[PDB]
Design a protein around this nucleic acid. Structure first.
Ligand SMILES: Nc1ccccc1NC(=O)CCC/C=C/CC(=O)Nc1ccccc1
Lengths: 71, 71
DNA sequence: AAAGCTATTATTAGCTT
DNA sequence: TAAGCTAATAATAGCTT
């Protein structure tokens, strides 16, 4: 980025929503790439600060989860 | 990297294990940064191709999950 | 070997219209 | 404004020892 930042909670709800949308995309993109490159099951559940749910899974969520609990 | 790659399953078990260890770290690092920067609950469950489990959660893994199912 | 290096591609923080 | 740009930081693929 234009400037290095420090990893601490962004206080401005506006920049926080924006950063959240950029980085959520970035996080799902890498999760997907890791699933394909290395052949693994992955599940990513994300609730933003307003409690809205976002999710990614390399297959049906319900399966990754049960494999976790059965583990 | 030294060369751009294409997103497809790595056929060599050796390079696949190596890429998996590098990128898993990279994926958890971004998940963590997103949790802190934007104040959200996150859960990431990963099973490699040999079925070993790896996981990250911004709180107890089982709390994020219950919040998902209760959702 | 396998732990680390670096040239290179990828992501992104702040800015711009 | 908010959609997109780009200067700059970050991650990593292949190499190095
Ligand atoms: N079908 C499906 C298709 C596409 C995307 C997602 C889904 N899947 C769901 O929409 C619901 C997931 C159900 C979860 C099954 C296992 C489980 O319930 N695991 C658990 C729950 C609470 C606490 C701990 C562990």
């Amino acid at each position: 980025g234009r400037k290095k930042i420090q990893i601490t909670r962004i206080m401005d709800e506006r920049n926080r929503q924006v950063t959240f949308t950029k980085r959520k995309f970035g996080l799902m993109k890498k999760a997907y790439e890791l699933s394909v490159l290395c052949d693994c099951e992955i599940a990513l559940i994300i609730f933003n600060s307003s409690n809205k749910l976002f999710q990614y899974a390399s297959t049906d969520m319900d399966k990754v989860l049960l494999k976790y609990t059965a583990y």
